[PDB]
Design a protein around this ligand. Structure first.
Ligand code: CHL
Ligand code: CHL
Ligand code: CLA
Ligand code: CLA
Ligand code: CLA
Ligand code: CLA
Ligand code: CLA
Ligand code: CLA
Ligand code: LUT
Ligand code: LUT
Lengths: 150, 41, 198, 207
């Protein structure tokens, strides 16, 4: 954390300033009441909103003038890494768990490959929401998690 | 036609799936752009 | 006949209906395995029981405070200051005791034979036979623990948890109290709803 | 109860085999073979019935501009633009309320489609019951007080056919009104009058 918060970084302010002037420059050729003008003014308003949020959410900045992320585990920045991540692992786990629920449903059947190239959508729709409680995979792990043959 | 349903759910199932995903992702961004962090906690 | 959480649908097979509060409700097949089912039954009990007191503990004082019979802070506020002993001391204490009494029912769950050793001297014991339904001193009044009677406990617990879920979520966004939230809704329901708040 | 010498949408043609003629309103019309398979068909029949019933209620929507145009009334607001109004409590709230009741209504009909029973009960009073056999004809006092619903085939068929035919007509109607407004930016009835005044030059082309 050898950095300075973005709220109080001159370089971070110079970037917002320089960016807006560039978009405003383009604003000149199109005159006022105009489609491009409204499009550029919308980018400018989207630009201000962006920088505003970064400062607002206490993100440090580097001498470069750009925010940098802390992933150490520090509590002030869970938003930077840890919070989104857990969110990921939830979804990743969801997808994988549902995907594995399908293969087991498919495995003891006729031609199993037939449903791997042509999806059983009724079956899939039945199993998709099981991923919602996928971290109760843990309780499968206490018993039938993985194969004993290997 | 059973069969038409059958053409579907092939790798057209992938594109219908990813097109839906792309749409959802795009709208989220349109709604919440330039997000570098999760700020709700 | 059993109760159907969903009329048209059929109940799953592992749900015999020999269980209190069984309405064939396992759409995600969490209880397909029987062991999981036992564990979950026990879990539902306790999650349901704590919620009962909690909802009650949380709600009633708020109501009484408004009546003016007594003055206490709102549940989401009991935490800051004002107690003999710090917050830390209570915790460690809460922990030591909760740790003992549970690391305690757990034994009865794995193998149902942990009723003796009461107190340290062995004179007193618990006589009975259902997990998560201990007897003895636990039931001073000896109300028949009739099946169906158990049905009522579960329903309340299930209800309590929706309430608890409601209180907490309601707290955010609202920034007020459940009873307060209720008054706002009661004063003018069509203008006070999740719609006006969010 | 199939009739093969029934009139057809296409007099010369041959109808598909699945379109038996047993069903009400069957003119042997499925060029795309959408009703090609029995399972799909049952579903389609129910869907058409609902669309037809809903469309008919919608037709009333056509009805109001009539009185407002001449009789008057508080129904003067055009159906178009009707939604964005301030009455009562805000629309969004209304919609949410609507979603719950109607949901229960189908999370309701749906069970019936999938099964044969559930009519069998009024959950609160398990005795009110009510029964009508057949699919999208629940029957009972709530839906069939007069009881003209229960009857005999031939009669039921005739009556039922009437239900569907009006519905199909109603469906085109509603769609026609929606398009009519956009292409004309006016009232449908005005469109109606305008047409009569100058059917010769008053058409889609006029604009
Ligand atoms: C069992 C469930 C349990 C739950 C759900 C909570 C929930 C809460 N505690 Mg609590 N606590 C719980 C147990 C315990 N707390 C405390 C001690 C405290 C303290 C000391 C504080 C809280 C505070 C808070 C609240 C933080 C406000 C917030 O984020 O608003 C959105 C929050 C309502 C904070 C509070 O009351 O702030 C006003 C607070 O300062 N709790 C102890 C013993 C030390 C507990 C023991 O079991
Ligand atoms: C059920 C059929 C139904 C149909 C066919 C329509 C159709 C319409 N609504 Mg409704 N609505 C319907 C149900 C409902 N609407 C609303 C609430 C609204 C609102 C709030 C608005 C509409 C509007 C519109 C129009 C938008 C025009 C458009 O897309 O132009 C391309 C359109 C005519 C908009 C309008 O102003 O239409 C005149 C509009 O603002 N509708 C609710 C909630 C109570 C409904 C509930 O079932
Ligand atoms: C390099 C190895 C390494 C590893 C594996 C960790 C791991 C962790 N750190 Mg650490 N850290 C490290 C190096 C490391 N750190 C270094 C070099 C520094 C110098 C700044 C820090 C400074 C630091 C701070 C200030 C904090 C952490 C915290 C944490 C914990 C956050 C995760 C959590 O909240 O619980 C898991 C949550 C779920 C599973 C949900 C996690 C155990 C945080 C912590 O203490 O946790 C309470 C925290 O406050 N770290
Ligand atoms: C044809 C062009 C078109 C247009 C004009 C719109 C317009 C809109 N979309 Mg759609 N969308 C489109 C194409 C389009 N979309 C396509 C091709 C897809 C992929 C199939 C989507 C997938 C999509 C999703 C998932 C959502 C929208 C939503 C919205 C609405 C934003 C609601 C809001 O208040 O913001 C703010 C909302 C907050 C919660 C804040 C807005 C009316 C949103 C909506 O209204 O839900 C139904 C929504 O989340 N769109
Ligand atoms: C659901 C579980 C639960 C929990 C965790 C709490 C926790 C708490 N209660 Mg509560 N209470 C509950 C249920 C609960 N209560 C129920 C079901 C009721 C009856 C409706 C009450 C009625 C109640 C009253 C009247 C008061 C509390 C108070 C308190 C606080 C001090 C408790 C204390 O002195 O130690 C126990 C010490 C003893 C000597 C006993 C503490 C936050 C007090 C408070 O508001 O803060 C001081 C207090 O005024 N509670
Ligand atoms: C005669 C007075 C007396 C005294 C001083 C104690 C004291 C004690 N009992 Mg006991 N108990 C008593 C009567 C008494 N009991 C009676 C009359 C019954 C029913 C007939 C019980 C049933 C009982 C059970 C089931 C347990 C205790 C346990 C205990 C110990 C801690 C938990 C607790 O507070 O009680 C509770 C503590 C040494 C606990 C224990 O010894 O640890 C396992 C415990 O499990 N008691
Ligand atoms: C416990 C969780 C739970 C959940 C998620 C549901 C969910 C549902 N129930 Mg069920 N029900 C439950 C427990 C539950 N029930 C229990 C314990 C009983 C007593 C045995 C019932 C008895 C019951 C009856 C009699 C009926 C339902 C019906 C419904 C559906 C109504 C849809 C709706 O409200 O409109 C939309 C709501 C929105 C928010 C949109 C819905 C799927 C109705 C149905 O037929 O659904 C198929 C119905 O008639 N329920
Ligand atoms: C021409 C339109 C039409 C026709 C011929 C029918 C005919 C029928 N309906 Mg249907 N129905 C309709 C429209 C129609 N319905 C609409 C629009 C809805 C949604 C509101 C329904 C909802 C409905 C239900 C839930 C049920 C039926 C049932 C039946 C059968 C019962 C007796 C009967 O004929 O009702 C009367 C025939 C008429 C032509 C009525 C005259 C038109 C009215 C009085 C005008 C109302 C004025 C208007 C508000 C302005 C019969 C085949 C029942 C059945 O089959 O048995 C279970 C059944 O339960 N209908
Ligand atoms: C079943 C199933 C299966 C299928 O298959 C699938 C699905 C559907 C997924 C599912 C699910 C379900 C569910 C949802 C469940 C939930 C539950 C809950 C919510 C609970 C709570 C629960 C809750 C709870 C316990 C709570 C409790 C609480 C408490 C005590 C409290 C206390 C307190 C008080 C007094 C006062 C202060 O101031 C605060 C406090 C301290 C805090
Ligand atoms: C695919 C195919 C294939 C095969 O094989 C052959 C064939 C048969 C040819 C085909 C086709 C067919 C068709 C064409 C269909 C169509 C339909 C329709 C159009 C419907 C509508 C339908 C329609 C509908 C429902 C509608 C409804 C409506 C409504 C309710 C309304 C309501 C309302 C009103 C009143 C008034 C107010 O102010 C507003 C509102 C609220 C809005």
């Amino acid at each position: 954390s050898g950095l300075t918060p973005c709220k109080e970084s001159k370089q971070f302010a110079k970037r917002e300033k320089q960016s807006i002037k560039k978009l405003e420059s383009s604003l000149k050729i199109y005159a006022a009441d105009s489609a491009p003008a409204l499009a550029i003014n919308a980018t400018i308003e989207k630009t201000k909103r962006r920088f505003d949020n970064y400062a607002k959410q206490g993100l440090l900045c580097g001498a470069d003038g750009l925010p940098h992320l802390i992933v150490s585990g520090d509590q002030r920045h869970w938003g930077e890494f840890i919070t989104p991540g857990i969110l990921f692992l939830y979804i990743a786990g969801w997808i994988g768990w549902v995907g594995r629920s399908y293969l087991i449903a498919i495995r003891d059947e006729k031609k199993p490959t037939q449903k791997e190239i042509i999806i059983d959508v009724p079956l899939a729709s039945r199993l998709v929401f099981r991923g919602f409680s996928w971290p109760i995979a843990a309780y499968r792990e206490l018993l039938n998690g993985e194969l004993v043959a290997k | 036609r059973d069969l038409k349903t059958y053409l579907s759910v092939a790798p057209v199932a992938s594109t219908l799936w990813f097109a839906a995903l792309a749409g959802l992702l795009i709208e989220i961004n349109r709604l919440f752009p330039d997000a570098l962090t999760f700020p709700f906690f | 006949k059993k109760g159907e959480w969903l009329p048209g649908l059929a109940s799953p097979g592992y749900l015999t209906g020999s269980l209190p509060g069984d309405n064939g409700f396992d759409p995600l097949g969490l209880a397909e395995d029987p062991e999981n089912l036992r564990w979950f039954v026990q879990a539902e009990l306790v999650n349901g029981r704590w919620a009962m007191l909690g909802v009650a503990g949380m709600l009633l004082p708020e109501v009484f405070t408004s009546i003016g019979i007594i003055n206490v802070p709102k549940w989401y506020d009991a935490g800051k200051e004002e107690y003999f002993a710090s917050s830390s001391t209570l915790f460690v204490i809460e922990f030591i005791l909760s740790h003992y009494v549970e690391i305690r029912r757990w034994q009865d769950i794995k193998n149902p034979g942990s009723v003796n050793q009461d107190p340290i001297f062995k004179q007193y014991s618990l006589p009975a036979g259902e997990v998560g339904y201990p007897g003895g001193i636990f039931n001073p009044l000896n109300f028949a623990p009739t099946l169906e009677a158990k049905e009522k406990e579960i329903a309340n617990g299930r209800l309590a948890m929706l309430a608890f879920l409601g209180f907490i979520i309601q707290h955010n966004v609202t920034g007020k109290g459940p009873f307060d939230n209720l008054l706002q809704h009661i004063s003018d329901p069509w203008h006070n709803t999740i719609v006006q708040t969010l | 109860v199939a009739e093969p010498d029934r009139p057809l949408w296409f007099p010369g043609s041959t109808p598909p085999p699945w379109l038996d003629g047993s069903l009400p309103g069957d003119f042997g019309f499925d060029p795309l073979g959408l009703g090609s398979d029995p399972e799909s068909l049952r579903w389609n029949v129910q869907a058409e019935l609902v669309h037809s019933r809903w469309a008919m209620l919608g037709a009333a929507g056509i009805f109001i501009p009539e009185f407002l145009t001449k009789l008057g009334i508080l129904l003067t607001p055009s159906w178009y633009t009707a939604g964005e109004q301030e009455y009562f409590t805000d629309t969004t709230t209304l919609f949410i309320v609507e979603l719950v009741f109607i949901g229960w209504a189908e999370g309701r009909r749906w069970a019936d489609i999938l099964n044969p029973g559930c009519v069998n009960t009024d959950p609160i009073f398990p005795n009110n019951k009510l029964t009508g056999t057949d699919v999208g004809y629940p029957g009972g006092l709530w839906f069939d007080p007069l009881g003209w619903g229960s009857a005999s085939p031939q009669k039921l068929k005739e009556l039922r056919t009437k239900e569907i035919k009006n519905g199909r007509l109603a469906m085109l109607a509603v769609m026609g009104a929606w398009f009519q407004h956009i292409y004309t930016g006016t009232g449908p009835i005005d469109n109606l009058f305008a047409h009569l005044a100058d059917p010769g030059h008053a058409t889609i082309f006029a604009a």
